[PDB]
Symmetry: D3
Subunit: 252 residues, 6 copies
């Protein structure tokens, strides 16, 4: 028993992860069974509530990927309930300051390293009675860097011992820097900001991840040395596939 993403990193390999915005277990299991190391459930920009995330985490684990959640907000009590429901990866949006990164770290570890409340319903079933001793290793925590403010604060954020590193939200970052909501961009200012965050993460001996909208862009990010790359949202892949089926059906 081990965190599949931590196993990638311990073997000097990056992790590739899925991204779900659609509630339900069937597609969660089917995607987890593909060559994804993790599958992230998006609880920020989706209609997925806690009652719907709980059985999705089970389905991903059965499919053979590490269950991750991108939370609605950086809130310790929300993050703790997800950990106890068998979320083994947490990505907290809009972490703009060292203090906010400490708030995330506080949720991911038991005392004395954090203030995580004890009652691990699903981790105890997966890991057994030996869980508390290894609990910190079973969990991956990434602070999202999505703003001018987070970019300015990146060295202070990376100095927080309890987070594994940072996950870049490139569309919110492009918007905050005064651009359109650019997806998978080469825009020089946005790309220089993202390169800066990766360079500082690795200099600090921390991990860096990035959200991607396509397989093509994910290959570029992996080939730049990102540690955790997501591609691409279930609803986006499904809509694109339907549009293409319809286009081919209705062609002369």
């Amino acid at each position: 028993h081990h965190n599949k993403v931590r196993t990638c990193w311990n073997e000097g390999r990056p992790a590739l992860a899925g991204w779900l915005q659609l509630p339900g277990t069937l597609h969660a299991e089917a995607l987890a069974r593909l060559d994804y190391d993790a599958v992230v459930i998006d609880m920020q920009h989706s209609p997925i509530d806690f009652g719907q995330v709980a059985p999705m985490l089970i389905a991903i684990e059965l499919g053979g990927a590490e269950p991750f959640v991108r939370t609605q907000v950086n809130d310790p009590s929300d993050i703790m309930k997800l950990l106890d429901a068998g979320a083994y990866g947490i990505i907290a949006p809009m972490v703009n300051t060292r203090a906010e990164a400490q708030t995330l770290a506080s949720a991911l570890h038991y005392s004395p390293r954090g203030l995580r409340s004890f009652g691990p319903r699903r981790p105890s079933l997966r890991y057994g009675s030996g869980y508390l001793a290894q609990a910190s290793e079973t969990v991956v925590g990434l602070a999202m860097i999505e703003t001018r403010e987070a970019l300015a604060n990146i060295d202070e954020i990376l100095s927080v011992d309890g987070i594994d590193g940072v996950f870049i939200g490139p569309t919110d970052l492009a918007l905050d820097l005064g651009h359109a909501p650019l997806v998978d961009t080469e825009e020089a200012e946005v790309v220089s900001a993202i390169a800066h965050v990766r360079e500082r993460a690795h200099a600090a001996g921390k991990r860096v991840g990035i959200w991607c909208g396509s397989g093509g862009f994910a290959r570029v990010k992996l080939a730049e040395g990102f540690d955790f790359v997501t591609a691409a949202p279930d609803l986006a892949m499904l809509s694109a596939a339907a549009r293409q089926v319809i286009a081919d059906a209705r062609a002369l």
Copy 2:
């Protein structure tokens, strides 16, 4: 108006989506594409009645006609779906004239059928004039997917109150002793499919089929199918994800 009936009345076939995943977000998103209808599969999916109800609403808001492929040809199940705003019904494994008569009985009020009266959602869409035009608001297709159905095709097509038939080519292939392959080239299955189509059109009825690709759907439209579905949500998403991963991993 029933968007599929509007296609037909205007001399055009209908192209439909096919959902095996529960939920409203992809249902609305696919309904807003160039689909005339979106079918929710209650047979080969985890979708129960509590989940189908909001999906019907989402499809209608997206601007496609909501259809349901039911778990079974059962009149009371069909009547509850109709009153929940399912405006097309595809009933699996209709094998006999009696079974086609059971389907027709569910889709029409007395004296044409025995549909129980309590049209919760259709009354909201169509108003107090609903009863008079109820029959035309609903499209009903009996599924031809066995040797027995294929043997009994003319008598199934004889039943007034069904709009026509919808081929289940994987179940048909399997019952003919062939592999249940999507979009099959198997000569006997392809000949059985063309026979059902010709028989439906000769009886003044409509015919539909399930497809797994845009390419196959283009052929069935060209061959004169009236209602073509392509392709299942879970299949399309799985194949897309496989491609993304293969692109990403180089």
Copy 3:
């Protein structure tokens, strides 16, 4: 005690609510009014089994007897509702003595019927003595809503184990070739309703009916109906909202 049976044993009819909206808050709130029973409609509503279960609990806490009008006269569906704490069953479209016998078979343990034993919620309410008094805890009504049922009334009423019959006057009006109007004045429908009532009372059975207004319910109570429902939640809420809007907009 079954509150409806207590009304009957004390020489009083029962007045019931009628829910087509899922959820527990209005179910408890209507149960706390001067209703003896609240019926949950699983036929002409979006309510599935997962939603009916907590509604039964809410009605019982509010202090009305929980009833269910099932989607269909199916023994296994009725048995699951009984074991979930439905203490009244109204089965739609009971047209023959055989169909009434199917309903009675579901409502009684061997040797009277064939009800499967596993009474999850009734055992909590009634304790370990439940089996001996099980029959008296449940009220079962066959719906008379077709020409065929009306023709077969005496033989439906002959079936021991059903408490009596419940008229579906909109389906009856429609099957008699009339408008399916709530609370109809149509002479033949009104005469058919009085006939069913007289036949039930002559057979020593109970009779109920669906009403759309307090005024009509008052008449049916005065005419000697034993179980009168008025009026559906969605209808009452819709008419109330229309009035509020008309008041507000001046």
Copy 4:
């Protein structure tokens, strides 16, 4: 495509809205189809959770009213997830200070006018790819005035550019001022407070709304020049209608 409430206001007309405390799609659609411009779903004083609100917003839009939510609390991340689920009106309870009104404004607009996170799942489907350019206009935001403290701070609250105005909670206001929980009151002190808030809202070129328990009271509020009037809660109208049916059924 336009916000039906904003269209009323642009045409110098007030908006009349429904108020739901009962979960489910069928009554939501049926009421939306009546002569209501909007229907508000109450997530503060109801058992409605996020999983239940999501399909109700769809049902209201299909019925042809603008979907609104009265949120449980003034929390930016909760408000953002509702916007991305196709809530086009937000009413945030207990907004007592200018700082709290700024917190609400921050959630309702993308950078640089706010800090709303980008991922508009349902608005993108309703409005298309041209959504970001008009996003602020598609959304109506009202701060609730329900306390002595909010009343004292009304000019500071109204000075916040990012809110369309204020929505009065007359029962909580009556309670905070030391009265019984008065519904649709003429009580001189409560009525003078409410008149003050309307006068200051209109002086500031802002909109003012009020919650009503009856059609009669809603007519009075509309005829005083309120911009957004709700009447009346589904559970209240249903209970009153049932009581009257029973009273008529059991009459001699």
Copy 5:
């Protein structure tokens, strides 16, 4: 591999859990204990299809084979459960050879049965080779719980495609005119149970039974039952809570 079939192929019986409570947390937790299978009861529980679906996934992750005791022996209900990853089916009240043939028809693809093809979850577990080995992945047991079933035992056991029979001793006791007691000592019921066991083993079939205690389950295993369930989640939890309260209150 089907874990129960693996027990049988290795000359061992299977011990199973029994859930009447909906939800995934206790389902996974009991599946991780020394149970070979966990049965979800859809007959005497509030569990609907929407709730059973995630429970099947939880049991499989816990490392027990997921089974379902269905509400009724209905082919379309069984086929939807199979496609949702129910790998054992126990059908209540199988009373005749015809009813056993109806069960067998649902569990096998043509030409052995008439199972409709669309194996959503089994295809994920078993891959594209699923069709060829489908029959062996599923365990099907007909319930013997009436006088009529007991009378028709040899002809039920004659049906190829059913793995064997599962005794419902409380319904059997009640239909024989005895108390529906868990783990009964009633001489005629005990003799009926041993007869069904001997008949199943003589026909080369498997036999199972429902138990209420570890002590009784130990005896049935020793007597040579192939599939023993003990004990229902709600019963075990209720008795445990009663003990805790009695300990606490002194």
Copy 6:
């Protein structure tokens, strides 16, 4: 109509309560029907979301125990929505300071004693139109003491008028004091801390509760004079009962 726990306390009797971590109504009703005065639903260390807690509160009340909730976090708006859903007992985890105890008190009372928002959907049905006058008595509020920090602050926490007292989280307390996650412990340091909290609660004329993992430990806590004792979690009792059934089934 009365709070069953307050009735115990008014009659000089302690209350014994159940503890649910499993969603659903059937076991909630069955346990409520046993000799428990209350049943607590755990929304911190369970997968229970608001949509699942709502019908469980109904089931417990019908079974004839007082419905309690141990909340995910000490958040006033979450606590208010539970009160309006017919939670009549609130246990808020991780209350570490007098200020946090005041935050809990603020949620449990209407103005002027608190700032609870008015809209009591279920309490109004249970208690009728006379509810506001007795509302404070219908509700039991307990602040959880689970940390070194809460222990140091126990006299300041107990000085908050609006809480009935404190509920000890012995496992989180043992962890915070540097021990293993000890369940039902006699460990001298943890036991002295718990005895101190009980002694200070009773000296302050307040009530004290404690979570137990067994019937045996609950008897000891009752016999020490605790006012509110819980035993034992549904999932723990069910797992132990299954293990024993299996052990007996597979015995030689």
